[PDB]
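Margin note: ligand = magnesium ion.
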Amino acid sequence: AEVMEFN
Amino acid sequence: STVATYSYTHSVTYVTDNILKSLKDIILLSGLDPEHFADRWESNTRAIKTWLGTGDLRKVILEIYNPATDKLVTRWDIDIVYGWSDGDGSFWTDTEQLKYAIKKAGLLPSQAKYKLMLDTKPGRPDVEGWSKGSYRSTDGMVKQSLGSTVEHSGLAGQAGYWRQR
Amino acid sequence: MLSIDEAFRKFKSRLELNEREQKNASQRQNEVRDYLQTKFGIARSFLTGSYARYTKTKPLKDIDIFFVLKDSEKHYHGKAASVVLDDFHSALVEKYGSAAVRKQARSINVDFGVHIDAEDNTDYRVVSVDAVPAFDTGDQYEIPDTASGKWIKTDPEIHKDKATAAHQAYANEWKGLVRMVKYWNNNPKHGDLKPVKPSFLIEVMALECLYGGWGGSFDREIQSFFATLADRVHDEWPDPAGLGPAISNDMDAARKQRAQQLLFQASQDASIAIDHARRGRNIEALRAWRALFGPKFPLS
Ligand SMILES: [Mg+2]
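Resulting structure:
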């Protein structure tokens, strides 16, 4: 899994 | 262009909207300021809806941290359960579930801040404005699960919170 | 109009040990000890395990009895675990017959032919005991373990202390909640294989999974307890005493996957029952809880 954050 | 009363996409919409509603309630019940969450509602919505639809969303993560130390005070995970069928099953958004857990989570530090991230399956479609992120350390912490928080016909978000020890 | 809270209070009460059951357990121990002392050098025995911690659910089955062997039987201690267990099995089969005696990983089960009726009542009688050969090394014991073939260290005192301390920090509701989940674990709807093996793992996980003190609502405590069990049953759960194998070592991968699935379904059934009550369907809620747990959960 790969965790994502907003930009 | 038939629109079905019961469908996977309606269940996805329900769960998307009420996961975000539930996180807003967690922020409010925690004594925090929802403005930062408000400012990103539409971008959070677009990404959550997209990756639910393809089965790529694993968890919604809300880190709550102390700004003075930058350490987690707690972290709320909404794990997705991909158990949908038919679309005409029972549904609910169990706010009372969160109020019972939040009592047990314990008081938060003054002026605690929060950050939302999305855990996704590697093959996920790119969503504009979202990049690989980093977790705040959960060393010394374990996760408490609460059960099905947001439910629609088997597609569900199951809330849990991290605590010390 | 039976409320959910009242129903759970009744359910809690109906899982509690009573004095006739207590005396019947002591009578079976005497019966089993006195017979085994005619076939082995046994210095003493004592009721132990969940039964002595008051964390055993009802009907009372698999009550652990440590049979402490004399030094003159210490040759068993240097032999493989199966040797003393097979000897206990043969000896007990002589008295109770082959059908009533079942060889287990660390004990021999003796079933006393007690009938369990449709309400899970036994006329205040225990159903079976687990005879455990044991050597007293001083402050702790060693018992046979067929999984390794070796003798493993164990300390019942520590398990009792940890249960007591968890119970005090949960407004004395901790042991009741544990008994409720062990009761679900024994529900016949699961078939011949319990969802969680051993049932002690439910208690060990509870030491950590029941967190933050008692919050006052059984439906929520149960919903979260099941949800946390399912999410964490794949963690390593060591012996709380730090002496023997991990308590989570007895299920293989397929059985652990089944354990999480059935634990998750229990969590989902609890959510459905909570939803019923939220929608004012009080009878459906009670019937949902009874279908989850079993006959001892009341409807009125
Ligand atoms: Mg036991």
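The first strand of chain A starts at residue 2 and ends at 6.
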